[PDB]
Amino acid sequence: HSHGLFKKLGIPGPTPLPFLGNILSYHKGFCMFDMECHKKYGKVWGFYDGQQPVLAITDPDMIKTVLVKECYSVFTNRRPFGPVGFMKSAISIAEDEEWKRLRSLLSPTFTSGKLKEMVPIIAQYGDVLVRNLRREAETGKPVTLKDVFGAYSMDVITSTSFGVNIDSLNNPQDPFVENTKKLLRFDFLDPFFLSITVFPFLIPILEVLNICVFPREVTNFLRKSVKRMKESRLEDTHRVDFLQLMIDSQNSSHKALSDLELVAQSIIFIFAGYETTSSVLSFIMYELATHPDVQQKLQEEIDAVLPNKAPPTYDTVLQMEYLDMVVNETLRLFPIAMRLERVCKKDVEINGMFIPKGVVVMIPSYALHRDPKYWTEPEKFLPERFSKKNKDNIDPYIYTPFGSGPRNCIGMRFALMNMKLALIRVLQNFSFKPCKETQIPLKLSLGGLLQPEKPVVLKVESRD
Numbered sequence: 001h002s003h004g005l006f007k008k009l010g011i012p013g014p015t016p017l018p019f020l021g022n023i024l025s026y027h028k029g030f031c032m033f034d035m036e037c038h039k040k041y042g043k044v045w046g047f048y049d050g051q052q053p054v055l056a057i058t059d060p061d062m063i064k065t066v067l068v069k070e071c072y073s074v075f076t077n078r079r080p081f082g083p084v085g086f087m088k089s090a091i092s093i094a095e096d097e098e099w100k101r102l103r104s105l106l107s108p109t110f111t112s113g114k115l116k117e118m119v120p121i122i123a124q125y126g127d128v129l130v131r132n133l134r135r136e137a138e139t140g141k142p143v144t145l146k147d148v149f150g151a152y153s154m155d156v157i158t159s160t161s162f163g164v165n166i167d168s169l170n171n172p173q174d175p176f177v178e179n180t181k182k183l184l185r186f187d188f189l190d191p192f193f194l195s196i197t198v199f200p201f202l203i204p205i206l207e208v209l210n211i212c213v214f215p216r217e218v219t220n221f222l223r224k225s226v227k228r229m230k231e232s233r234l235e236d237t238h239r240v241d242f243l244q245l246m247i248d249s250q251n252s253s254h255k256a257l258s259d260l261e262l263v264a265q266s267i268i269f270i271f272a273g274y275e276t277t278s279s280v281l282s283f284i285m286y287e288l289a290t291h292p293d294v295q296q297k298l299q300e301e302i303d304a305v306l307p308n309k310a311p312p313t314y315d316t317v318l319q320m321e322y323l324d325m326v327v328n329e330t331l332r333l334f335p336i337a338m339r340l341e342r343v344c345k346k347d348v349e350i351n352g353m354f355i356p357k358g359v360v361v362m363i364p365s366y367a368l369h370r371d372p373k374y375w376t377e378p379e380k381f382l383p384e385r386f387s388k389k390n391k392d393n394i395d396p397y398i399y400t401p402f403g404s405g406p407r408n409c410i411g412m413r414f415a416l417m418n419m420k421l422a423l424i425r426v427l428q429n430f431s432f433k434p435c436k437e438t439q440i441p442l443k444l445s446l447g448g449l450l451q452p453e454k455p456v457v458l459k460v461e462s463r464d
C-alpha cells in the first residue's frame, strides 16, 4: 500500500481505505468528486484510484508545464485502461516514441486542406439528418436527440472512412452499423473497470485469455472490412476519406503504417468521434431550447451569412461567430472527457511541487470550467463569455475541452466543423423548444461518462 505517499509529500486529499483507496467517493461520479475535492483542498489534492496515486493540479502554469512543456519528456502517456490487445497500437493508447511516430503519420490527415475536401460528404448527411428530423417532427411526438444525432455522427466517421454511405437511422440493421454502433465510450466506474483498477494484476490474466475491452466480434469484422475495402475497391484505381489518406500515406522519418495499425487508428477515430459528437450536439440543442433568445440570434446569424437555406461551406462556417461562441460555451459546461490525465514517467519538480515517478497527474477540466474564481455565474449558459472582445480573458490551460499540448484531440478541427455543419442546417430548417418530458434543469449521470440522467427528448417545429 502506497497510501500515504501524499502526506509524506505534504499534499492534501481524502483518506484512502485499504485496497479500495478512494473509489467509494465515485458514487456521485468523477465530476462531483473533483469539485468537492477542489473546494475542500484548494488548488492541489491527491487521491488513490485503488493503489494508483492520482495528483490533481489547477495551476495554469503547472498544467502548461505538464500538457505542453514537459510532454515528450515526463508527461507523454495516458494511464493504462485495461486488456487492449492489438488496439495498443491506436494513437490514443500508444505510449512514448511509438505514439510520437503515429502522431506524425496522422498529423497531415487532420489538416484544414483535407477537412475542407471532406465538408461536401459531411454536409450531404446534414441534409440526411434534416430530412430524417423532418419526419419525426411532423409525426407530432418528442425527438430523442440521442438517436438522430447518434445516426448523424455514425453516418459521418463511417463515410469519411471510405464510401460506405448509409442512412443508419433508416438502416438500423446494416451490419456495418450494427458493429460500429457498439463502439461506445467506457464508463470507467462500471464494476469491471473499477474491479480492474483495484486489481490491476488481472489485466495480464485477461490478455493471455485473449479478452479485450474492444469487442473482438466488432474489431475482427472491421479488421476484415478495412482489408477487403483497402484492396477489392481501390486497387482498381480515389475518395477523400481518413482510410484513403492512410492508404495513400502507407505508399509515401519513422513511417510504414502496419496494415493492422491502420485498422486500429480507424477503430479509435470512430471510438473518439461517435458518442462524443452525439453527446455534445444534444447538450447544445438543450441549451439552445432552454435559452430561445440564443437559438433565434444563432438562427438569424446563419440566415444572414447563408441567405435562403443556402448550403453550408468551409469558409462560411469560419465567419459565423455566435455559433462558435454557443459551441465553445456548451463545451465549457459539458467537457465530455471530464478529466485530462498524464503519467509521470520519472521523478521531477515543476514550478515548486515535486512529482514522484508512476503518479497520474489529473487536470479536473469539469471543475476548472465551473470554478467561480475564473467564471461569473458558472452554472449560467452565457455564450457572450467567448466574444472576440472577451476571449483574451480566457486562460487556455483552464478551458481544455479538447485538451492542449502535443497530445490534444487530433480531430478537434473536424469535430467542431462536423457539429457546426449539422447545427447550421438543423437550425436552418427547424426550431427546438422545451417539451413536457424535457427535464429542466438537466440532471447529469452519476456514472463515469458525462451524460444526461434521462435522455434529452424535445419538441421540434419546422419554421415554415
Ligand code: HEM
Binding pocket: 091, 092, 093, 103, 157, 268, 269, 270, 272, 273, 274, 276, 277, 280, 336, 337, 340, 341, 400, 401, 402, 403, 404, 406, 407, 408, 409, 410, 411, 412, 414, 415, 416
Ligand atoms: C466534441 C468532440 C470531441 C471532444 C470534446 C474531444 C475531446 C478530446 C479530449 C479531451 C482528448 C484528450 C486530450 C488530452 O488528453 O489532452 C481527446 C483525445 C483524442 N481525440 Fe478527441 N474529442 C472529440 C472528437 C474527436 C474526433 C471526432 C476524433 C477523430 C475523428 C477524435 C480523436 C481523438 C484522438 C485520436 C485523441 C487522442 C490523441 C492522442 O493521443 O494524441 N476526437 N479528445
